[PDB]
Design an enzyme around this catalytic site. Sequence first.
Site, PDB file in Angstrom:
ATOM      1  N   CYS A  65       0.792  -1.227   0.000  1.00  0.00           N
ATOM      2  CA  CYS A  65       0.000   0.000   0.000  1.00  0.00           C
ATOM      3  C   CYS A  65       0.831   1.287   0.000  1.00  0.00           C
ATOM      4  O   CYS A  65       1.575   1.574   0.947  1.00  0.00           O
ATOM      5  CB  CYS A  65      -0.948   0.021   1.202  1.00  0.00           C
ATOM      6  N   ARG A  68      -0.013   4.623   2.841  1.00  0.00           N
ATOM      7  CA  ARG A  68       0.135   4.390   4.278  1.00  0.00           C
ATOM      8  C   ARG A  68       0.473   5.596   5.158  1.00  0.00           C
ATOM      9  O   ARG A  68       0.404   5.491   6.380  1.00  0.00           O
ATOM     10  CB  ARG A  68       1.126   3.254   4.555  1.00  0.00           C
ATOM     11  N   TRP A 237      -9.352   6.174  -0.678  1.00  0.00           N
ATOM     12  CA  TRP A 237      -9.768   6.731  -1.952  1.00  0.00           C
ATOM     13  C   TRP A 237      -8.879   6.093  -3.006  1.00  0.00           C
ATOM     14  O   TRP A 237      -7.922   5.399  -2.679  1.00  0.00           O
ATOM     15  CB  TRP A 237      -9.630   8.252  -1.969  1.00  0.00           C
ATOM     16  N   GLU A 242      -5.121   3.326 -10.770  1.00  0.00           N
ATOM     17  CA  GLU A 242      -5.884   2.101 -10.556  1.00  0.00           C
ATOM     18  C   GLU A 242      -7.054   2.044 -11.525  1.00  0.00           C
ATOM     19  O   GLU A 242      -7.418   0.972 -12.018  1.00  0.00           O
ATOM     20  CB  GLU A 242      -6.419   2.080  -9.120  1.00  0.00           C
TER      21      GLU A 242
HETATM   22  C1  HEM Z   1      -6.390   6.502   1.878  1.00  0.00           C
HETATM   23  C2  HEM Z   1      -6.157   6.200   0.584  1.00  0.00           C
HETATM   24  C3  HEM Z   1      -5.470   4.980   0.109  1.00  0.00           C
HETATM   25  C4  HEM Z   1      -4.825   4.885  -1.087  1.00  0.00           C
HETATM   26  C5  HEM Z   1      -4.720   5.990  -2.107  1.00  0.00           C
HETATM   27  C6  HEM Z   1      -4.296   3.576  -1.203  1.00  0.00           C
HETATM   28  C7  HEM Z   1      -3.599   3.138  -2.329  1.00  0.00           C
HETATM   29  C8  HEM Z   1      -3.363   1.794  -2.556  1.00  0.00           C
HETATM   30  C9  HEM Z   1      -2.954   1.235  -3.800  1.00  0.00           C
HETATM   31  C10 HEM Z   1      -2.763   1.980  -5.095  1.00  0.00           C
HETATM   32  C11 HEM Z   1      -2.797  -0.101  -3.630  1.00  0.00           C
HETATM   33  C12 HEM Z   1      -2.362  -1.091  -4.694  1.00  0.00           C
HETATM   34  C13 HEM Z   1      -3.525  -1.666  -5.503  1.00  0.00           C
HETATM   35  C14 HEM Z   1      -2.993  -2.018  -6.873  1.00  0.00           C
HETATM   36  O1  HEM Z   1      -1.907  -1.542  -7.275  1.00  0.00           O
HETATM   37  O2  HEM Z   1      -3.631  -2.777  -7.622  1.00  0.00           O
HETATM   38  C15 HEM Z   1      -3.086  -0.380  -2.273  1.00  0.00           C
HETATM   39  C16 HEM Z   1      -2.971  -1.649  -1.758  1.00  0.00           C
HETATM   40  C17 HEM Z   1      -3.437  -1.904  -0.483  1.00  0.00           C
HETATM   41  N1  HEM Z   1      -3.944  -1.013   0.414  1.00  0.00           N
HETATM   42 FE1  HEM Z   1      -4.025   0.891   0.295  1.00  0.00          FE
HETATM   43  N2  HEM Z   1      -4.610   2.863  -0.121  1.00  0.00           N
HETATM   44  C18 HEM Z   1      -5.300   3.650   0.748  1.00  0.00           C
HETATM   45  C19 HEM Z   1      -5.873   3.318   1.983  1.00  0.00           C
HETATM   46  C20 HEM Z   1      -5.874   2.037   2.524  1.00  0.00           C
HETATM   47  C21 HEM Z   1      -6.581   1.639   3.677  1.00  0.00           C
HETATM   48  C22 HEM Z   1      -7.479   2.558   4.475  1.00  0.00           C
HETATM   49  C23 HEM Z   1      -6.278   0.302   3.922  1.00  0.00           C
HETATM   50  C24 HEM Z   1      -6.755  -0.573   5.020  1.00  0.00           C
HETATM   51  C25 HEM Z   1      -7.109  -0.149   6.249  1.00  0.00           C
HETATM   52  C26 HEM Z   1      -5.380  -0.099   2.873  1.00  0.00           C
HETATM   53  C27 HEM Z   1      -4.826  -1.354   2.728  1.00  0.00           C
HETATM   54  C28 HEM Z   1      -4.256  -1.763   1.506  1.00  0.00           C
HETATM   55  C29 HEM Z   1      -3.978  -3.188   1.266  1.00  0.00           C
HETATM   56  C30 HEM Z   1      -4.218  -4.339   2.209  1.00  0.00           C
HETATM   57  C31 HEM Z   1      -3.476  -3.288   0.026  1.00  0.00           C
HETATM   58  C32 HEM Z   1      -3.007  -4.559  -0.668  1.00  0.00           C
HETATM   59  C33 HEM Z   1      -4.110  -5.399  -1.314  1.00  0.00           C
HETATM   60  C34 HEM Z   1      -3.595  -6.709  -1.879  1.00  0.00           C
HETATM   61  O3  HEM Z   1      -2.528  -7.242  -1.494  1.00  0.00           O
HETATM   62  O4  HEM Z   1      -4.269  -7.286  -2.755  1.00  0.00           O
HETATM   63  N3  HEM Z   1      -5.147   0.991   2.059  1.00  0.00           N
HETATM   64  N4  HEM Z   1      -3.403   0.797  -1.609  1.00  0.00           N
HETATM   65  N1  LIG Z   2      -1.662  -4.316  -8.931  1.00  0.00           N
HETATM   66  C1  LIG Z   2      -1.310  -5.505  -9.171  1.00  0.00           C
HETATM   67  N2  LIG Z   2      -2.174  -6.523  -9.173  1.00  0.00           N
HETATM   68  C2  LIG Z   2      -3.535  -6.467  -9.256  1.00  0.00           C
HETATM   69  C3  LIG Z   2      -4.136  -7.217 -10.265  1.00  0.00           C
HETATM   70  C4  LIG Z   2      -5.520  -7.246 -10.421  1.00  0.00           C
HETATM   71  C5  LIG Z   2      -6.320  -6.529  -9.541  1.00  0.00           C
HETATM   72  C6  LIG Z   2      -5.743  -5.787  -8.518  1.00  0.00           C
HETATM   73  O1  LIG Z   2      -6.613  -5.106  -7.695  1.00  0.00           O
HETATM   74  C7  LIG Z   2      -6.229  -4.411  -6.509  1.00  0.00           C
HETATM   75  C8  LIG Z   2      -7.510  -4.153  -5.706  1.00  0.00           C
HETATM   76  O2  LIG Z   2      -7.979  -5.425  -5.277  1.00  0.00           O
HETATM   77  C9  LIG Z   2      -7.177  -3.269  -4.565  1.00  0.00           C
HETATM   78  C10 LIG Z   2      -6.708  -3.770  -3.352  1.00  0.00           C
HETATM   79  C11 LIG Z   2      -6.382  -2.885  -2.322  1.00  0.00           C
HETATM   80  C12 LIG Z   2      -6.510  -1.510  -2.515  1.00  0.00           C
HETATM   81  C13 LIG Z   2      -6.993  -0.995  -3.723  1.00  0.00           C
HETATM   82  N3  LIG Z   2      -7.124   0.345  -3.991  1.00  0.00           N
HETATM   83  C14 LIG Z   2      -7.470   1.296  -3.117  1.00  0.00           C
HETATM   84  N4  LIG Z   2      -7.201   2.524  -3.345  1.00  0.00           N
HETATM   85  C15 LIG Z   2      -8.182   0.877  -1.888  1.00  0.00           C
HETATM   86  C16 LIG Z   2      -9.213  -0.061  -1.647  1.00  0.00           C
HETATM   87  C17 LIG Z   2      -9.462  -0.069  -0.261  1.00  0.00           C
HETATM   88  C18 LIG Z   2      -8.657   0.772   0.527  1.00  0.00           C
HETATM   89  S1  LIG Z   2      -7.608   1.604  -0.488  1.00  0.00           S
HETATM   90  C19 LIG Z   2      -7.312  -1.894  -4.739  1.00  0.00           C
HETATM   91  C20 LIG Z   2      -4.355  -5.755  -8.362  1.00  0.00           C
HETATM   92  C21 LIG Z   2       0.132  -5.773  -9.457  1.00  0.00           C
HETATM   93  C22 LIG Z   2       1.308  -5.109  -9.090  1.00  0.00           C
HETATM   94  C23 LIG Z   2       2.440  -5.755  -9.625  1.00  0.00           C
HETATM   95  C24 LIG Z   2       2.221  -6.894 -10.400  1.00  0.00           C
HETATM   96  S2  LIG Z   2       0.509  -7.147 -10.447  1.00  0.00           S
HETATM   97 CL   LIG Z   3     -10.227  -1.379  -8.062  1.00  0.00          CL
END
Ligand code: HEM
Ligand SMILES: N=C(Nc1cccc(OC[C@@H](O)c2cccc(NC(=N)c3cccs3)c2)c1)c1cccs1
Ligand SMILES: [Cl-]
Lengths: 362, 362
Positions: A65, A68, A237, A242
């Site tokens: 993330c 953070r 947000w 994304e």
């Molecule tokens: C406040 C604005 C936030 C932004 C802009 C943000 C942004 C992102 C982005 C861009 C990703 C990667 C998703 C992708 O590349 O496909 C991500 C992953 C993640 N974020 Fe954040 N995030 C935010 C808040 C949060 C919050 C509030 C939580 C939980 C309390 C959180 C937990 C995570 C987790 C667990 C992932 C990984 C999901 C996975 O492994 O599939 N984020 N975040």
């Molecule tokens: N981004 C990648 N994988 C991937 C592929 C398909 C869907 C996907 O959704 C993330 C989606 O499930 C997800 C998970 C966690 C956060 C977000 N986006 C947000 N802004 C938030 C949702 C909730 C809190 S923040 C969105 C991620 C890769 C990176 C490098 C190689 S593959």
């Molecule tokens: Cl999404």
Amino acid sequence: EEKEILWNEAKAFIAACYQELGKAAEVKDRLADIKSEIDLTGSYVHTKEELEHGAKMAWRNSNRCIGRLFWNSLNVIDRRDVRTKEEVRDALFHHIETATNNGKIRPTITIFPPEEKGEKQVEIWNHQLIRYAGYESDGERIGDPASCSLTAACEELGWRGERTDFDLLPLIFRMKGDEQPVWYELPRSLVIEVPITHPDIEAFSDLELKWYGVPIISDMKLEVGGIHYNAAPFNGWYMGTEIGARNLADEKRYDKLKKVASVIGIAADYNTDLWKDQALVELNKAVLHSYKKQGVSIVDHHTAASQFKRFEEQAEEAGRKLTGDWTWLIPPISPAATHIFHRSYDNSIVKPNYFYQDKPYE
Amino acid sequence: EEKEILWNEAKAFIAACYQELGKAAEVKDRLADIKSEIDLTGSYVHTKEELEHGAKMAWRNSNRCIGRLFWNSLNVIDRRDVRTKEEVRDALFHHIETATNNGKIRPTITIFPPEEKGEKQVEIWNHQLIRYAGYESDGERIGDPASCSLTAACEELGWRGERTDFDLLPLIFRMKGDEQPVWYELPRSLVIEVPITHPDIEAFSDLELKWYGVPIISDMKLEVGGIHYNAAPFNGWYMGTEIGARNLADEKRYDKLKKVASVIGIAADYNTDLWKDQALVELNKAVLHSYKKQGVSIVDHHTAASQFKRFEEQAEEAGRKLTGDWTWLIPPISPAATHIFHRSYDNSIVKPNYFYQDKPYE
Ligand code: HEM
Ligand SMILES: N=C(Nc1cccc(OC[C@@H](O)c2cccc(NC(=N)c3cccs3)c2)c1)c1cccs1
Ligand SMILES: [Cl-]
Ligand code: HEM
Ligand SMILES: N=C(Nc1cccc(OC[C@@H](O)c2cccc(NC(=N)c3cccs3)c2)c1)c1cccs1
Ligand SMILES: [Cl-]
């Protein structure tokens, strides 16, 4: 072993949590209480302070993330009191409303009762609370292909989509004791969506693209001190990429790059013209412009990386080890324009944290 | 142990190499010869066939290289016969000429005598045979900042740059027995350069950007069957993003994005405008256009990824394990538009291979 796993995790979490809260003196007595409680019941119950701080630490420890920096301002809603599907449904409706906040998005998590003996009390089927349906049949592809399996599962249960490219999936979840999940249509008044327009290319609206305002991940498990909260939907947000570089761009998602190329007036014929790159930039500009114009929170990847740099600095100043997953932290466009690309990160898993869990369908 | 390391590596390489060449029957006798030779001399000498195929395998095993589809067509020049600095210099001049091939670049490696007892016979100081000097002093920054330390070292040895932004560094290398390296100015007739222009933005030429045609990495060690060829410069052609998204774009390199933004007529004031992304696309379009227009080989990242997909398929069909470094294989612009982004790779190190070695200066 299972009791012992719980006790070891509890010891580690309570010590760290209370240290961070300046409650180091209360650790000894709290641990005894927990130890007695585990002996007598097979588990223990978090205080509201432990729960709130645990959910925050879990975000702070999420290696993938980029957002953070704002971990400590997470709004934690304690719904460990729910027992009925109406209460669950209403809690999810409420999460949508309060997180959305008329567009000024509040990072929020709603925490439902945790697994008891690995037995879920509430089992959420949605990947996100708000997401579009997908359909595939006889050459015909409609909506979001990523939602095809959940959509088919909903339609087995009597739901029927209008088969637009943007049907809102119903909330769908199962209660302990029930053989089937229940589903509830989302009230449209609760769901903010943003039409995609471009700041200077008028024809961009011809694509009739839109996306939903608030991504609310509802299929991950929050683990705090050995307690498994399998149902704990959370939102932030969006980062613009994304939507513009993945949801609308991926060939296995909405696959809009060729159409974007056409409306911005460039040929989509030669790799060397970099038309996909150019389309990606304009689509991503359009996404940011549209969310900003409507007053719905969003962040661009440059600003997000700058915020993440401050998170790195803050961690160092606090004496906390930084963990991260480079492969997810780099944005999917212009990654080398961010500082993230040019350093390395330790991908170690620290708890509390958010974890994947098996789908209850498919 | 050192002898034993050599013998173990030799055994492994000869078996694999001869198997690939259909020379499996000759393995036993060749191994004995090598074993005797190691006993008597402390080392062994590769046949020209072993050397050629070894260098090819090394490319094939380079995890970070997206261009590996063409591994088997590497032109291997055996210069294990050189003993004088004039012979080394002339061999490097020749490598430039034959690799350049009037712009139709030939992937080529020139192999010099290997380390004897960890003692180098020839020690090359250049990072690439063709590269621009860099200078930093009193607020004043000129040329390529990445070359600052080598440039300063050359100037200690009596070389003097004109202090343009594109001074060609001299060849600089040291022979076994000499305390100091020698340097030789590059004949300009040997060095192809490409002025950067844009296919439809006439003002782009106002930036007066250019880059050299042929990247020739000259500071890596080729290791084949336990033999250490520390001096073995190799080249391919460029992928356009290396020039447009890194060499000319990086803030610690030529840092041209703000100037690019100005000439393409966009403001460079707001992150949400994605001006860096837009500048990156136009600069990268300009790079590809310019190399193509001049008739100098180059590949775009989309085409390169497609070629790499075929390499993956070819490896599978040959029963060879595929290794790769995802973090280097993804291009630095639009990475998610390539298949590479959407899979994972095993980053295991297989030999023969190319390795980093410590700089002889700084
Ligand atoms: C406040 C604005 C936030 C932004 C802009 C943000 C942004 C992102 C982005 C861009 C990703 C990667 C998703 C992708 O590349 O496909 C991500 C992953 C993640 N974020 Fe954040 N995030 C935010 C808040 C949060 C919050 C509030 C939580 C939980 C309390 C959180 C937990 C995570 C987790 C667990 C992932 C990984 C999901 C996975 O492994 O599939 N984020 N975040
Ligand atoms: N981004 C990648 N994988 C991937 C592929 C398909 C869907 C996907 O959704 C993330 C989606 O499930 C997800 C998970 C966690 C956060 C977000 N986006 C947000 N802004 C938030 C949702 C909730 C809190 S923040 C969105 C991620 C890769 C990176 C490098 C190689 S593959
Ligand atoms: Cl999404
Ligand atoms: C024929 C055209 C070739 C292309 C287009 C190509 C492309 C590339 C690219 C883009 C990189 C990554 C550099 C970066 O991202 O900064 C790379 C790395 C590499 N390539 Fe290739 N390559 C080619 C030929 C070769 C040849 C002929 C060799 C050696 C015989 C080779 C060995 C390597 C090695 C060793 C690296 C990694 C360098 C490091 O770790 O620092 N490549 N290649
Ligand atoms: N690309 C990265 N690092 C990096 C940083 C500075 C310089 C650099 O130069 C590569 C340069 O030395 C080099 C090395 C090997 C090949 C090339 N490019 C070529 N086309 C060839 C040269 C010789 C044969 S092919 C160029 C690479 C990163 C990826 C992920 C995180 S950082
Ligand atoms: Cl380079």
